[PDB]
Short mmCIF file of C-alpha atoms in Angstrom, two decimals:
data_model
loop_
_atom_site.label_atom_id
_atom_site.label_comp_id
_atom_site.label_asym_id
_atom_site.label_seq_id
_atom_site.Cartn_x
_atom_site.Cartn_y
_atom_site.Cartn_z
CA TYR A 1 -12.51 16.32 -7.34
CA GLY A 2 -9.25 16.86 -5.53
CA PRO A 3 -8.14 17.35 -2.26
CA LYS A 4 -7.90 21.10 -0.55
CA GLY A 5 -4.41 22.90 -0.49
CA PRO A 6 -2.34 23.43 2.62
CA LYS A 7 -3.03 26.04 5.22
CA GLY A 8 -2.10 29.68 4.76
CA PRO A 9 0.44 31.30 6.67
CA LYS A 10 -0.75 32.60 9.99
CA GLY A 11 -1.61 36.30 10.07
CA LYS A 12 0.32 39.40 10.58
CA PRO A 13 0.43 40.25 14.44
CA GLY A 14 -2.06 43.42 15.59
CA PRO A 15 -1.28 46.57 16.34
CA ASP A 16 -0.12 48.03 19.50
CA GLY A 17 -2.37 48.83 22.92
CA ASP A 18 -3.48 51.89 23.88
CA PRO A 19 -1.04 53.55 26.80
CA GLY A 20 -2.56 52.48 30.65
CA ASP A 21 -4.92 54.45 32.58
CA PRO A 22 -3.64 57.22 34.41
CA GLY A 23 -1.95 56.90 37.81
CA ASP A 24 -3.58 57.48 40.93
CA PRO A 25 -3.00 60.75 42.58
CA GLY A 26 0.06 62.14 44.48
CA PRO A 27 -0.28 62.09 48.37
CA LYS A 28 -1.16 65.48 50.05
CA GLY A 29 1.89 67.88 51.06
CA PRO A 30 3.58 67.96 54.07
CA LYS A 31 2.00 70.07 56.48
CA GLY A 32 3.41 73.50 57.43
CA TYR B 1 -6.07 20.31 -8.14
CA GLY B 2 -8.37 20.76 -5.70
CA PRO B 3 -10.15 23.75 -3.84
CA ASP B 4 -7.99 26.41 -1.87
CA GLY B 5 -6.20 25.28 1.53
CA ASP B 6 -8.07 27.15 4.73
CA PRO B 7 -6.88 30.73 5.39
CA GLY B 8 -3.85 30.72 7.85
CA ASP B 9 -4.90 31.36 11.82
CA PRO B 10 -5.24 35.05 13.16
CA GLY B 11 -2.14 36.83 13.64
CA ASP B 12 -1.25 37.35 17.61
CA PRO B 13 -2.47 39.77 19.51
CA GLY B 14 -0.66 42.99 19.29
CA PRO B 15 1.80 44.14 22.17
CA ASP B 16 0.70 45.19 25.33
CA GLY B 17 0.12 49.24 25.17
CA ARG B 18 2.56 51.51 26.81
CA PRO B 19 2.74 52.24 30.66
CA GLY B 20 -0.38 54.81 31.77
CA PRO B 21 0.14 58.58 32.28
CA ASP B 22 1.39 59.67 35.84
CA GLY B 23 -1.62 60.27 38.22
CA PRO B 24 -2.73 63.95 39.64
CA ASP B 25 -0.75 66.01 41.33
CA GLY B 26 -1.80 65.56 45.10
CA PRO B 27 -3.12 68.60 47.20
CA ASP B 28 -1.43 71.11 48.71
CA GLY B 29 -0.34 70.47 52.17
CA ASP B 30 -2.29 72.11 55.44
CA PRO B 31 -0.62 75.54 56.94
CA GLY B 32 1.24 74.99 59.95
CA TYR C 1 -3.83 19.39 -3.72
CA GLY C 2 -5.29 22.93 -4.15
CA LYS C 3 -3.29 26.04 -3.57
CA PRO C 4 -2.29 27.28 -0.12
CA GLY C 5 -5.40 29.03 1.93
CA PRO C 6 -4.82 32.92 2.29
CA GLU C 7 -2.58 34.56 4.82
CA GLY C 8 -4.61 34.74 8.12
CA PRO C 9 -6.40 38.05 9.57
CA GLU C 10 -4.16 40.46 11.53
CA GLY C 11 -4.65 39.75 14.93
CA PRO C 12 -6.02 41.91 17.12
CA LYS C 13 -4.96 44.74 18.69
CA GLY C 14 -2.91 44.61 22.00
CA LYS C 15 -4.09 45.27 25.41
CA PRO C 16 -3.82 48.63 27.39
CA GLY C 17 -0.80 49.10 29.13
CA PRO C 18 -0.14 49.01 32.74
CA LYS C 19 -1.69 51.90 35.03
CA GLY C 20 0.63 54.57 35.52
CA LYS C 21 2.81 55.61 38.21
CA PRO C 22 1.61 57.67 40.93
CA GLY C 23 1.55 61.84 40.96
CA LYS C 24 3.76 63.91 42.51
CA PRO C 25 3.02 65.02 46.15
CA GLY C 26 1.13 68.12 47.05
CA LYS C 27 3.20 71.13 47.59
CA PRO C 28 4.15 71.75 51.60
CA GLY C 29 1.81 73.77 53.35
CA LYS C 30 3.26 77.36 54.40
CA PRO C 31 3.76 78.25 58.11
#
């Protein structure tokens, strides 16, 4: 038996994450 | 020769996603 | 020595982006 070969190249980077959660609501408009 | 080497490490986590959507419109203002 | 190991698996999907900006203000109230 012989020794195992060299460890392989690291994998490619993963795909992009999703867009973030929606922001909070705007404030109430100014009173008249 | 020997057995195949170990698999490479997993790739890097993918990039962070983009900023989330803008929040909803705020409620309209009170009558004066 | 044996042959090189295989390429590793692709990385996982990235984390969600930052939370979005606040929405715009409501319209001004009427007189």
